[PDB]
């Protein structure tokens, strides 16, 4: 069980840790989050009480280092930092725990939600989407644009998701125009899976990361990428059976976790109706179709 | 974006452009089978590809053999259209290639865009104009070459005959669209108007009769009356 200590909490902020969140008051004696499960990536995220603009946060894996949070009054945000002095860190944490100044990662034993949302998400792949090689953790916020968005502007602050474009030479074989546009299997299986991602686990990892950035930061570009990766599978006639079954589980838990009230900003009517009711895979996503129909029947 | 009544003169500027109409590509007769079911029989069709500034018509004849053994023919016909238009563009010298292609039906946009990915600088545009190009098969010489074809074939025409020697391309386009609208609303009457007077003839190298300027004004007036009539006969007004 790992710990992310906080130096202090000088400004009032809502703090998220994965799918949980809690409010900290200005100058409240808060010194971090303990009992964080080992084995998963995690995200610790922030919304200031005085400017709900810019949700921001940090993806990290406690196996990769000892990380802590410290507010910067010049840049005006809570920053993640790495402590290289292991004994300093253990001594800081042990003292904060002794004084019970930490919140406990509040995992229910029955509850596999976070595993089910991050099953294929790896820190090493996050660090290639979010490029800042001097840190082991990755910063994301509400406003960051994707490489694809920039093509249609600071490249160092971009989300380098894999570009997917259904009307592109990459997607469409010369001489198979109609075939490749109406059945995207060659783009999915040969171009993306064999060529770019190498395997379906990496594809699902990026899909899951894009969803989580959409949900936790309201990142529009991330939302676009999530839907594009869903649509590419659903619009393929030939998809490995294990991938369709896993996709159904992935989407089921994403839809389950989404706030009931954000379905108008985080769900695209066209994509979901096409995927569940018109696409090649309209009959292959039973769990997702069932939860969508019972939770968001308006969208459909 | 889309072409409409507001940017109408753009059709006659010096940027090469083509209209593409696909409404006569896939053509069928519907009939009863011996068992009393219904079946279709395809007949030859054509892509109508027109430069509105010069009158040059690229008429690609679509022979019924292209449909043999194929499914979902109404969908295939849009992609076949786009394939043939792309092939035509590639066949033209660079300085003759269009800068814009305007499709008369919005369902042609994605097929044509996908087939023209190699030409990112050619704009593919819809239009809000309701153009009457479906009536092209009411022009006798065009219908004749389509029905007589035994194989895929491209035939080149000037749909304005020699009109541009005397009138502008705006006025020629307006005359063409009036003639075609009339033929579309009441083909028999329209053709009566055009051929009533046997002393006015169609030159071998032309599509329409050799009307004088004054005769065209009379013809054009008769076509407006017909369209208004039919609009009355239709709605009872
Ligand atoms: C076109 O980009 C901006 C466009 C108005 N949408 C947004 O800014 C939002 N998008 N999403 C997905 C959110 O969760 C917050 C609001």
UniProtKB/Swiss-Prot annotation, chain A:
Keyword DNA-binding: no
A Gene Ontology cellular-component term: U5 snRNP
Region Leucine-zipper: start-end pairs: 244-265
Principal location: cytoplasm
Modified residues (Phosphoserine): 236
One BP term from GO: spliceosomal snRNP assembly
Modified residues annotated as Phosphothreonine in this record: 257
InterPro entries documented for this protein: AAR2, AAR2_C, AAR2_C_sf, Aar2_N, AAR2_N_sf
Keywords, in A-Z order: Cytoplasm, mRNA processing, mRNA splicing, Nucleus, Phosphoprotein
Modifications made to the protein after synthesis: Phosphorylated on serine and tyrosine residues.
Disulfide bonds: none
Keyword Ribosomal protein among UniProt keywords: no
Localization: Cytoplasm; Nucleus
Similarity comment: Belongs to the AAR2 family.
Complex and partners: Heterodimer. Interacts with PRP8 (via RNase H homology domain and MPN domain), competing with BRR2 for the same binding site. Component of a U5 snRNP complex that contains at least the U5 snRNA, PRP8, SNU114, AAR2, SMB1, SMD1, SMD2, SMD3, SME1, SMX2 and SMX3, but is not a component of the U4/U6-U5 tri-snRNP complex.
Misc remark: Present with 7330 molecules/cell in log phase SD medium.
Described purpose of this protein according to its UniProt entry: Component of the U5 snRNP complex that is required for spliceosome assembly and for pre-mRNA splicing. Involved in splicing pre-mRNA of the A1 cistron and other genes that are important for cell growth.
UniProt protein name: A1 cistron-splicing factor AAR2
Organism: Saccharomyces cerevisiae (strain ATCC 204508 / S288c)
Recorded name of the encoding gene: AAR2
UniProtKB/Swiss-Prot annotation, chain B:
Organism of origin: Saccharomyces cerevisiae (strain ATCC 204508 / S288c) (Baker's yeast)
Outcome of mutating residue 22 to A: Reduced growth at 30 degrees Celsius. Strongly reduced growth at 16 degrees Celsius. Strongly reduced growth at 35 degrees Celsius
Complex formation: Component of the U4/U6-U5 tri-snRNP complex composed of the U4, U6 and U5 snRNAs and at least PRP3, PRP4, PRP6, PRP8, PRP18, PRP31, PRP38, SNU13, SNU23, SNU66, SNU114, SPP381, SMB1, SMD1, SMD2, SMD3, SMX2, SMX3, LSM2, LSM3, LSM4, LSM5, LSM6, LSM7, LSM8, BRR2 and DIB1.
Subcellular location, record wording: Nucleus
Protein's UniProt name: Pre-mRNA-splicing factor 8
Domain of life of the native organism: Eukaryota
UniProt remark on domains: The MPN (JAB/Mov34) domain has structural similarity with deubiquitinating enzymes, but lacks the residues that would bind the catalytic metal ion. Contains a region with structural similarity to reverse transcriptase, presenting the classical thumb, fingers and palm architecture, but lacks enzyme activity, since the essential metal-binding residues are not conserved.
Stretch forming the signal peptide: none
Chain residue ranges for the region called RNase H homology domain: 7-237
């Amino acid at each position: 069980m790992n710990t992310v200590p906080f130096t202090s909490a000088p400004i009032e902020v809502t703090i998220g840790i994965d799918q949980y969140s809690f409010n900290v008051k200005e100058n409240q004696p808060f010194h971090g989050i303990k009992d964080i499960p080992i084995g998963h990536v995690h995200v610790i995220h922030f919304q200031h009480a005085d400017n709900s603009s810019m949700r921001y946060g940090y993806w990290f894996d406690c196996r990769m280092g000892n990380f802590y949070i410290q507010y910067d009054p010049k840049d005006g945000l809570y920053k993640m930092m790495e402590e290289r002095d292991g004994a300093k860190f253990e001594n800081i944490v042990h003292n904060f725990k002794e004084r019970q100044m930490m919140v406990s990662y509040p995992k229910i034993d029955e509850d596999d939600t976070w595993y089910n949302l991050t099953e294929f998400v790896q820190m090493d792949k996050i660090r290639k989407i979010v490029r800042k090689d001097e840190n082991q953790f990755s910063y994301v916020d509400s406003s960051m644009t994707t490489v694809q968005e920039n093509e249609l502007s600071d490249p160092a602050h971009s989300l380098n998701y894999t570009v997917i474009n259904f009307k592109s030479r990459e997607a469409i074989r010369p001489g198979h125009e109609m075939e490749d546009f109406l059945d995207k299997s060659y783009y999915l299986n040969t171009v993306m899976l064999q060529g770019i991602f190498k395997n379906s686990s990496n594809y699902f990892g990026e899909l899951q990361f894009a969803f989580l950035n959409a949900m936790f930061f309201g990142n529009y570009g991330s939302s676009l990428q999530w839907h594009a990766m869903i649509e590419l599978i659903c619009s393929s006639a030939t998809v490995p059976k294990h991938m369709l079954d896993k996709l159904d589980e992935i989407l089921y838990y994403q839809i389950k976790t989404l706030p009931e009230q954000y379905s108008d900003i985080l769900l695209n009517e066209r994509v979901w109706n096409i995927c569940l009711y018109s696409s090649f895979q309209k009959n292959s996503l039973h769990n997702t179709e069932k939860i969508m129909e019972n939770k968001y029947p308006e969208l459909l | 974006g889309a072409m409409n009544s507001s940017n109408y003169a753009e059709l006659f500027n010096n940027d090469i452009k083509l209209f593409v109409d696909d409404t006569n590509v896939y053509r069928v007769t519907v009939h009863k089978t011996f068992e009393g079911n219904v079946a279709t029989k395809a007949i030859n069709g054509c892509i109508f590809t027109l430069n509105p500034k010069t009158g040059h018509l690229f008429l690609k004849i679509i022979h019924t053999s292209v449909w043999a053994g194929q499914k979902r023919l109404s969908q295939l016909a849009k992609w076949k259209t786009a394939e043939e238009v792309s092939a035509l563009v590639r066949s033209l010298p660079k300085e003759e290639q269009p800068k814009q292609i305007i499709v008369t039906r919005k369902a042609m946009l994605d097929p044509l865009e996908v087939h023209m990915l190699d030409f990112p600088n050619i704009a593919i545009r819809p239009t809000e104009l309701r153009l009457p190009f479906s009536a092209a098969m009411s022009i006798d010489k065009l219908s004749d070459v389509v029905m007589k074809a035994t194989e895929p074939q491209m035939v080149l025409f000037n749909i304005y005959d020699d009109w541009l020697d005397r009138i502008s391309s705006y006025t020629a386009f307006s005359r063409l669209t009036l003639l075609l609208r009339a033929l579309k609303t009441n083909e028999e009457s329209a053709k009566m108007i055009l051929l009533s007077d046997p002393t006015i003839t169609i030159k071998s190298y032309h599509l329409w009769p050799s009307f004088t300027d004054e005769q065209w004004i009379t013809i054009e007036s008769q076509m407006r009356d017909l369209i208004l009539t039919e609009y009355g006969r239709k709605y009872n007004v």
